[PDB]
């Protein structure tokens, strides 16, 4: 129903991440923590770093327990390494509970912490299968559910401003909500539609059809989920498999052909600017992703606007122009529904019923002519064939 204590508990933006305040140790040490549905470790800065103004000090926590085990995590865009342990953890604008959770105390990292992001760690909300070093390291949410009466469900409303927020504004602005243990009806409009969680590792889903301004991309649906499709608040962009990316960009270019943009724009590298207030939203198409429904041979669609897939960025000249980066990019690891897609919707991670819910977000950016949408049902056949198998 209503979870006023957790509403508006997030800050941040799509490019730098959305974070929630947490406390670790006794006495409590306050830290800002990235909400990451694409990983499964609770990992916090525990040693000085040039981009950290605070970190977890294990020697100051009376409830700190050393697990005597290291963790080394090299990833595509960087690396983090640290020491495993446990401590008492709370979410000040969350359920009124304290849990004993695993913590990876980050002692060394490369390109992990973002200068100016305002977060000092990450909260991996996905399942134990992808926890590092292995699945025996119980993720935070699993500990929270096992130790308390908190229902096995969380929901996220990520709120993009629709324009750039400077250093001061991003610290003072409400970035959205993470409702732990429930669904808050004030965060969305219309109905919630659910897609099954295909498998519990990442939050894996199945896309069955893709349209650009109602025109079917017409690919074998297995291509859309090659090698998987996930919902990931820990990624900025909508990331698409190489072949799907190439087809989608061709169609988005064709729909917006009244204006030509340089190659660097479509590569997500360079910004495009328009005179203040003149962004031609109407020339860019809407993108509909059809997801497998909970009923046999039924699907539903989520429709996003260019106000979601064009990410607002401030100009190099700090001008009065309205500038953006194209927030759709290619992937070699499947589809990733990142922060820019999540900004259009209230997303319900219903772990108890192995399903993900989508509803139009009460804070999605739109114009007077178009809105994001969550609609259904549609008759869709052979949807299990859309799932990829190695
Ligand atoms: C894709 N992805 C993710 N889902 N989480 C990782 C991660 C986490 C643990 C271990 C390996 C990789 C990450 C690591 C560091 C930062 C961010 N996220 C951001 O900086 C960010 C910005 C906007 C949204 O998220 C995400 C990552 O690679």
UniProtKB/Swiss-Prot annotation:
Disulfide bonds join 159-363, 221-386, 273-323. N-Glycosylated. Addition of a bisecting N-acetylglucosamine by MGAT3 blocks lysosomal targeting, further degradation and is required for maintaining stability under stress conditions. Acetylated in the endoplasmic reticulum at Lys-69, Lys-218, Lys-222, Lys-228, Lys-242, Lys-243 and Lys-250. Acetylation by NAT8 and NAT8B is transient and deacetylation probably occurs in the Golgi. Acetylation regulates the maturation, the transport to the plasma membrane, the stability and the expression of the protein. GO terms for cellular component: axon; cell surface; dendrite; early endosome; endoplasmic reticulum lumen; endosome; endosome membrane; Golgi apparatus. GO terms for molecular function: amyloid-beta binding; aspartic-type endopeptidase activity; beta-aspartyl-peptidase activity; endopeptidase activity; enzyme binding; peptidase activity; protein serine/threonine kinase binding. It is an enzyme of class 3 (hydrolase). Its EC number is 3.4.23.46. Belongs to the peptidase A1 family. Monomer. Interacts with RTN1; RTN2; RTN3 and RTN4; the interaction leads to inhibition of amyloid precursor protein processing. Interacts with SNX6. Interacts with PCSK9. Interacts with NAT8 and NAT8B. Interacts with BIN1. Interacts (via extracellular domain) with ADAM10 (via extracellular domain). Interacts with SORL1; this interaction may affect binding with APP and hence reduce APP cleavage. Interacts with NRDC AND NRG1. DXXLL motif is required for a proper endocytosis and retrograde transport to the trans-Golgi network, as well as for regulation of lysosomal degradation. The transmembrane domain is necessary for its activity. It determines its late Golgi localization and access to its substrate, APP. This is Beta-secretase 1. The gene is BACE1. The chain holds residues 58 to 447 of 501 of the full protein.
């Amino acid at each position: 129903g209503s979870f006023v204590e957790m509403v508006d508990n997030l800050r941040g933006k799509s490019g730098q991440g959305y974070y929630v305040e947490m406390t670790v140790g006794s006495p409590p040490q306050t830290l800002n923590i990235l909400v990451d549905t694409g990983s499964s470790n609770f990992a916090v800065g525990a040693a000085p770093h040039p981009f950290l103004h605070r970190y977890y000090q294990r020697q100051l926590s009376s409830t700190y327990r050393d697990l005597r085990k290291g963790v080394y995590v090299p990833y595509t865009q960087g690396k983090w390494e640290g020491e495993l342990g446990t401590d008492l953890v709370s979410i000040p604008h969350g359920p009124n509970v304290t849990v004993r959770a695993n913590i990876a105390a980050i002692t060394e990292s490369d390109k992990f912490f973002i200068n100016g992001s305002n977060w000092e760690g990450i909260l991996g909300l996905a399942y134990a299968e992808i926890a590092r070093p292995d699945d025996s390291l119980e993720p935070f949410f699993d500990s929270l559910v096992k130790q308390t009466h908190v229902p096995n469900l969380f929901s996220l409303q990520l709120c993009g401003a629709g324009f750039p927020l400077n250093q001061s504004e991003v610290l003072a602005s409400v970035g959205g909500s993470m409702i732990i243990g429930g669904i808050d009806h004030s965060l969305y409009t219309g109905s919630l539609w659910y897609t099954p969680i295909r498998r519990e590792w990442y939050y894996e889903v199945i896309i069955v059809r893709v349209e650009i301004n109602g025109q079917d991309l017409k690919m074998d649906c297995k291509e859309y989920n090659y090698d998987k499709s996930i919902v990931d608040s820990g990624t900025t962009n909508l990331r698409l498999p190489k072949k799907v990316f190439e087809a989608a960009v061709k169609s988005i270019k064709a729909a917006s052909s009244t204006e030509k943009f340089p190659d660097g724009f479509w590569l997500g590298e360079q910004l495009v600017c328009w005179q203040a207030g003149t962004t031609p939203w109407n020339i860019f198409p809407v993108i509909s992703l059809y997801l497998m429904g909970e009923v046999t041979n039924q699907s539903f669609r989520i429709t996003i606007l260019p106000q979601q897939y064009l990410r607002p960025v401030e100009d190099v000249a700090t001008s009065q122009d309205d500038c953006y980066k194209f927030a759709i990019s290619q992937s070699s690891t499947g589809t990733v529904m990142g922060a820019v897609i999540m900004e259009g919707f209230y997303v319900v991670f219903d772990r108890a019923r192995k399903r993900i819910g989508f509803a139009v977000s009460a804070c999605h950016v739109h114009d007077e002519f178009r809105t994001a949408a969550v609609e259904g049902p549609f008759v869709t056949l052979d949807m299990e064939d859309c799932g990829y198998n190695i």
